[PDB]
Swiss-Prot record, chain A:
The chain holds residues 256 to 364 of 419 of the full protein. It comes from the Viruses. It is found in: Virion; Host cytoplasm; Secreted; Host extracellular space. Residues 1-109 form the CoV N CTD domain. Residues 3-106 are annotated as: Dimerization. Belongs to the betacoronavirus nucleocapsid protein family. Packages the positive strand viral genome RNA into a helical ribonucleocapsid (RNP) and plays a fundamental role during virion assembly through its interactions with the viral genome and membrane protein M. Plays an important role in enhancing the efficiency of subgenomic viral RNA transcription as well as viral replication. Attenuates the stress granules formation by reducing host G3BP1 access to host mRNAs under stress conditions. A motif (Nuclear localization signal) lies at residues 1-9. Homodimer, homotetramer, homooligomer with RNA. Both monomeric and oligomeric forms interact with RNA. Interacts with protein M. Interacts with protein E. Interacts with NSP3; this interaction serves to tether the genome to the newly translated replicase-transcriptase complex at a very early stage of infection. Interacts with host NLRP3 and ABHD8; these interactions disrupt the association between NLRP3 and ABHD8, increasing NLRP3 stability, ultimately leading to increased inflammasome activation. This is Nucleoprotein. Residues 5-85 are annotated as: Putative NLRP3 binding. ADP-ribosylated. The ADP-ribosylation is retained in the virion during infection. Phosphorylated on serine residues by host GSK3A and GSK3B. This promotes the solubility of homodimers that would otherwise aggregate. Host phosphatase would dephosphorylate the protein during assembly at M bound membranes.
């Protein structure tokens, strides 16, 4: 429907449907437990996750942007690091939240 | 330019608060931004070809759905790491212009002080 990068996951159109199953491959997303995958932006903690997502400006501002041609197409590559605010009183909760979702697929039945 | 108060990832660069001010000088280093010619650097989202760049920026949902996310703890703090690739549309008539525009900005900093 939308280009992948503009899709918004919800219960009606979930993370697996929008972005593919989570897995170890370089082309796959690795982020989200079963609850987040099932619900996308309907997830109870979506606001606390979304606080880390870049604005279009920040995405093109902060990131190392590349262009690669592979057999499947031409790709805009991006890499970056976003510093958590360790002064933020919720820092400890933000670490626990990200810990619950990074590579959670490894524990799925 | 009260824009400076927002966390780095929520900043919006404009003529009043440019890419350098919001996101640091472009450069080659591992977590230094490399994107933008002199014109985009000075204008941010006022750049008159911004919409044709922003079409490739991810939604929050796509950012956490598409990307490889990691977390690092270092002497500087805790960092959310991210890598990913966004496919351009080979079948879109505007594809060649899209490639020309992104190539205009990738590592453009190399050609000026």
């Amino acid at each position: 429907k939308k280009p992948r990068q503009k899709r918004t996951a919800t219960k009606a159109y979930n993370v697996t449907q929008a972005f593919g199953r989570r897995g170890p491959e370089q082309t796959q997303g690795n982020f989200g437990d079963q609850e987040l995958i099932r619900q996308g932006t309907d997830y109870k903690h979506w606001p606390q996750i979304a606080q880390f997502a870049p604005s279009a400006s920040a995405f093109f501002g902060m990131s190392r942007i590349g262009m690669e041609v592979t057999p499947s197409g031409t790709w805009l590559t991006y890499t970056g690091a976003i510093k958590l605010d360790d002064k933020d009183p919720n820092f400890k909760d933000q670490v626990i939240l990200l810990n619950k979702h990074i590579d959670a697929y490894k524990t799925f039945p």
